[PDB]
Amino acid sequence: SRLNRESVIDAALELLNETGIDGLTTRKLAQKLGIEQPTLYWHVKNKRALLDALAVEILARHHDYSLPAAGESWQSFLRNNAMSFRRALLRYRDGAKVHLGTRPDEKQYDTVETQLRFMTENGFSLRDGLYAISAVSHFTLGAVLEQQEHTAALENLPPLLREALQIMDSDDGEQAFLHGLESLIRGFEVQLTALLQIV
Amino acid sequence: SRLNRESVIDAALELLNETGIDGLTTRKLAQKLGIEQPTLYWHVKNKRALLDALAVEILARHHDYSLPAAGESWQSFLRNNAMSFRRALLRYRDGAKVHLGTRPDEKQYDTVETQLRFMTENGFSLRDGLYAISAVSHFTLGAVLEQQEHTAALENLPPLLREALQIMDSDDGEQAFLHGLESLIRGFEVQLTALLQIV
């Protein structure tokens, strides 16, 4: 079938949902596309190159809150941005593992730059803004990775542990994520407002 | 060579450092142990079973701050516990990926129970204590995963991005982790002390 970049991406994302990240192979992608492996190679050099592109395109397609609304507080931006990142990562099987290890692509530079500048315009030093943005990124990835990989992995319990596992087996991870996110953001705010004061 | 559980673990951890998680195979472990594959199978049924055991034994061996010191504040316990978890995860190649998706083993039940009880003794509801413990776990995993997988993965840059990448390429991830961790813990404290007050 059609082997423009868009269509190759499309097929690889469909395959990802079917196979997961470990099971995804270029041979299987060629099959899906109805082509021979050497044909695919002209378009897609290896699995690494494919995964890198998927990580970018999943966010381009589905991460809609990359930038602050006009007049938005930095707190609200980080909240909305994290929720959006989370959702985008969850949209595909093993989507957080596809993201893991990547760094901002040229196609995301202006976006990331804007996020950093926004933080510095709201009183963060570049370093402190970086630490905030990384912490949210790490927390969000971590939460989604554990959600997705725990699902992939699937009476002498002591009572709090039994109960805590009953709580966890009762939603998908969202409540715990959102509560953690609030804690994170509030801590960032306490730090920012402290300036040079012992806190 | 010797195929007691300890020695099999030992060899698998050595192999993990040599191959990484994706490259680790039972066939390669049998080679390392100087045995044939059917011999290994008696001891180790599959890679999953092996990884599960490694995740447990890495913490048993090297995560020394599972429990609060006598009289320790909950804040200090979470800090020390997170630092210890982080270090243990970093001790082996792809160590955070080995941990990912696991849940507490029978051999960790008393430990995890104690952590939960400790939080509830310090004023947390079980749910709020769970959310704190999960948030620290997720943040720590996320940070280490990104550190380890970014290393595994290894001029039109805009200036803040260029600068931020210079900052990141200057330590291993520790400074950003520790700063984030403080933000997280302080947010937990603001929440705990609020009780039923709008905050």
Ligand SMILES: CN(C)c1ccc(O)c2c1C[C@H]1C[C@H]3[C@H](N(C)C)C(O)=C(C(N)=O)C(=O)[C@@]3(O)C(O)=C1C2=O
């Ligand atoms: C320079 N910049 C801080 C870095 C450095 C190394 C990194 O590994 C990363 C960044 C930017 C962050 C921005 C975060 C942002 N957010 C805090 C989740 C984000 O919304 C985006 C985005 N493209 O909209 C990211 O790329 C991002 O998810 C991401 O993957 C990043 C990331 O991987």
Ligand SMILES: CN(C)c1ccc(O)c2c1C[C@H]1C[C@H]3[C@H](N(C)C)C(O)=C(C(N)=O)C(=O)[C@@]3(O)C(O)=C1C2=O
């Ligand atoms: C019931 N309990 C809260 C759960 C439920 C699901 C989970 O997936 C987990 C826990 C306990 C947490 C405790 C955390 C703890 N810490 C906050 C990092 C920890 O120190 C240990 C430990 N064994 O000392 C964990 O097992 C732990 O790393 C872990 O892997 C957990 C984990 O995987």
Ligand SMILES: [Cl-]
């Ligand atoms: Cl065709």
Ligand SMILES: [Cl-]
């Ligand atoms: Cl076609």
Ligand SMILES: [Cl-]
């Ligand atoms: Cl074509």
Ligand SMILES: [Cl-]
């Ligand atoms: Cl195209």
Ligand SMILES: [Cl-]
């Ligand atoms: Cl492949």
Ligand SMILES: [Cl-]
């Ligand atoms: Cl294949």
Ligand SMILES: [Cl-]
């Ligand atoms: Cl503020």
Ligand SMILES: [Cl-]
């Ligand atoms: Cl405070």
Ligand SMILES: [Cl-]
């Ligand atoms: Cl031998």
Ligand SMILES: [Cl-]
């Ligand atoms: Cl021997």
Ligand SMILES: [Cl-]
């Ligand atoms: Cl033996």
Ligand SMILES: [Cl-]
């Ligand atoms: Cl033994």
Ligand SMILES: [Cl-]
């Ligand atoms: Cl294997």
Ligand SMILES: [Cl-]
């Ligand atoms: Cl092999």
